[PDB]
Amino acid sequence: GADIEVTTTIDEDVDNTVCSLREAVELINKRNSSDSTVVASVKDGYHGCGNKDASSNIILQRDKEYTLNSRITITAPLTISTAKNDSTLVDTDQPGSHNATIKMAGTDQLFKIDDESVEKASFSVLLSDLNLQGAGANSKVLTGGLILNHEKLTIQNSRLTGGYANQGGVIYNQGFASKSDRTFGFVYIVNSLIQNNKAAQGGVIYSEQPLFLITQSVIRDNEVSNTSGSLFFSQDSFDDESTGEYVVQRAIGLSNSTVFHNKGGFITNVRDGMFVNNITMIKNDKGLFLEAPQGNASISNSILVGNTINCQANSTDKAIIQSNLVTTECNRNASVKVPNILYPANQKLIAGSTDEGVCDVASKDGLLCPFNTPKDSFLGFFKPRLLESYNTLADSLIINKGRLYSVGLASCETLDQRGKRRTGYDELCDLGAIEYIGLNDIFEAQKIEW
Amino acid sequence: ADIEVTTTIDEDVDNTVCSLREAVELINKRNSSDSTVVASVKDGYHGCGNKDASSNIILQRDKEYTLNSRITITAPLTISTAKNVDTDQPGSHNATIKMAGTDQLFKIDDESVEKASFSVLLSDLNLQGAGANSKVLTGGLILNHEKLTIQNSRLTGGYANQGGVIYNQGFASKSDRTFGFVYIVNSLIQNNKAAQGGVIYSEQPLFLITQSVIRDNEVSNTSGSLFFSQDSFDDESTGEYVVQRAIGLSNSTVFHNKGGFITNVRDGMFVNNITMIKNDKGLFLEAPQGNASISNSILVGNTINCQANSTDKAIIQSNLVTTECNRNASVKVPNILYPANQKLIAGSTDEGVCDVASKDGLLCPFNTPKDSFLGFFKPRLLSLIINKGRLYGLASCETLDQRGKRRTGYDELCDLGAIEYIGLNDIFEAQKIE
Ligand SMILES: [Mg+2]
Ligand SMILES: [Mg+2]
Ligand SMILES: [Mg+2]
């Protein structure tokens, strides 16, 4: 049926003619109630949010800001997204430039997602094309600065900012995973910008077990104040003998993501069952903390240099690190068939002197362009450089150094951070979050000449 | 008169017998705002007569009432066992509510956004959950969103993912008066299990357990707690709560529990005059403001007695402690150090007959007198706990002990733990000199 379009930007639950975001969620919660009188109470709507065969899709208007004075509790599957324009019209606007904003005006988290139904467990929630802004420095949140989650949470095409808490700056993810514990929270984030989030532990995500997957995203300017902690922190390991299947499945970890300028502790603590593939992790305080003692973790096809601490291992760890651009710090447990690419001492990582800015095509050194967001892209990245000092592609430390065979646990991703397909010509791919595709640097070098 | 349940089976069928489910439905429908639903129960509901029937549901002594799925309570009511003057052991004739399926026993919630919470009383009952056959996720016995009071009862067999006995929903504020609050008095909590919140999983610390026994429970997450609160109160309210002693644990015996901690002490909570011995893990301290008080308790004999996070400032005064629970910042009301070589219990086991002719045991083994519903560890006259508290001030003794006996003056002194030593039974039974 019809989607629920929120018709006021204020935070309210008052029976009147307008529909608020809180009321739109409360409508979907009540239609999902196990009490027949509650379901019948919202047969024709709830306090301004019309119903009568309405969908579970909540629509927010483009370029509008919706304020919350306290948390919204979600007890039923639903989606919240920004209204989409006509696709048959010329849309040259930059992606994500018209996202609706959900803004915390108080000191609370934005959402709590949980369920207390007799069976009928683990529903899904989709947050799409939204600007989620937390309380920031005014936050009083203990766990989950933006969201406390116990369900199947997917966030896409979104900005995640201002999530401050003691544990889990963006998300605190509850729940343990086993054959008997089937009601656990899981976090899936794709094509999103994660910035300005802080926590004492789990600066971005604090999860009780490795139950998150971050792909095609930018992670910048976040902090975990415990310098031994992590931005994506797993409190406990899995109950053994199951991690050998999780890693080959590549269901938990980080992929196709650019991670730079983060502060304090590590990006993530790599436990058994987790994987890291095709990420660009540079210019951070700390990179990867390795504690996969069974050897059921995989780190591949990534750029893991230019951080104050690139890798650091716990007392027992056997994480398989292969086909990465690394220094000696991260050259651990590498196989002879899939070795890492060692980072030479005399190697300049970024062209020019700025970590972020316009790239100088007429620069003879520098593996990567500075960070930049093209006008046709939501997220920015460090584009690999095809230098003139490369007689062949074998001279590059990044380009065509991976293998694109779900084969061998060292295969590149099918896509890159931008969502573009990695062609896999000659079964080869580029290290890091970005596959080299367009050759405008070569075109421009001919025009600048003479 | 009260609503008398006249069958032990579970049903909602229009016939000649009144079931517990139909007795609750009668009260729910009478409280409805729909005048047609109210009229449908004008002359009773499906066998439960309703002409002079109140909101008190009565179950028969020594009878077991089976539920095959949960009952949803949406209206104020009480459930209790019929009375009888009476010299039997208290609680020996309780009616039993037993889950025969895989569900929780009760969901207590009208699901109203605006309406303030209503009151439900469960008195003199044996509540037994599905146990190993449970499929419950939240609230092995009760999913609560209202003002739930449980007294004189047994709470056993509650198995769930969150909240072995009770899952308590709600946040407390002047603009949100729909929060649930659990008040448990003179009850036995035993053989319950959860991944988090082995007994109570609560969103905020909205519970007070007093004069009760907590034994043989488990929270499988070794970082979790039996009485677990997921969130904290507002910083501005914790100062009042700790002084008023609104939420926490008092006058209770806690032993033989497994897995994680007994409770995670957040700001606003208090612990006073408990005997917390022989557990896997004791208290987890999590009060960064310093607005939490732990006093007059016995906090030794557990594998882990206390453990705090980096920022905890919980006030720990006048307790029997080891290194983990001791604080050098308590100079005026210090704790008492428990020696290692001393035997905690003057007996061969943790439960059974007390060894009267001894000078090495601080407490008698756990024993239930025949004139009492709950048992306890009675102190012995030898010293480390007798007259070590002050009646009198966050460190004041409770006015009563677990048994409801008054802790007398005794030069403004009281005994640490859940039991006040009153009778000189130790000294009289030393007549064995032959
Ligand atoms: Mg309205
Ligand atoms: Mg009947
Ligand atoms: Mg209510």
Numbering used by the authors:
A (entry chain A): 2 to 406, 411 to 455
B (entry chain B): 3 to 86, 91 to 388, 397 to 406, 413 to 454
What's the paper's own text on this?
Here we introduce RFpeptides, a denoising diffusion-based pipeline for designing macrocyclic binders against protein targets of interest. X-ray structures for macrocycle-bound myeloid cell leukemia 1, γ-aminobutyric acid type A receptor-associated protein and RbtA complexes match closely with the computational models, with a Cα root-mean-square deviation < 1.5 Å to the design models. RFpeptides is not limited to generating macrocycles with particular motifs or topologies; the diffusion process generates macrocycles with diverse shapes and sizes and selects the topologies appropriate for the protein being targeted. Among the four targets tested here, binders for MCL1 and MDM2 have helical motifs, binders for GABARAP have a β-sheet topology and binders for RbtA sample looplike conformations that make extensive contacts with the flat surface of this target.
We designed macrocycles against Rhombotarget A (RbtA), a recently identified cell surface protein from the ESKAPE pathogen, Acinetobacter baumannii. There are no experimentally determined structures available for this protein and sequence-based searches against the Protein Data Bank (PDB) did not return notable matches to other protein structures. We predicted the structure of the 617-aa full-length protein using AF2 and RF2; both methods predicted similar overall structures (Cα r.m.s.d. of 0.4 Å over 509 residues excluding the signal peptide and transmembrane domain) with high confidence (predicted local distance difference test (pLDDT) > 90). AF2 and RF2 both predicted two distinct extracellular domains: an N-terminal β-helix domain and a C-terminal Ig-like domain. We expressed the Avi-tagged version of the RbtA N-terminal domain (residues 20–458) and used it for binding screens using SPR. The apo structure of the RbtA N-terminal domain, which is also the first experimentally determined structure from this class of bacterial proteins, matched our AF2 and RF2 predictions for this target very closely, with an overall Cɑ r.m.s.d. of 1.2 Å and 1.1 Å between the X-ray structure of the RbtA N-terminal domain and the AF2-predicted and RF2-predicted structures, respectively.
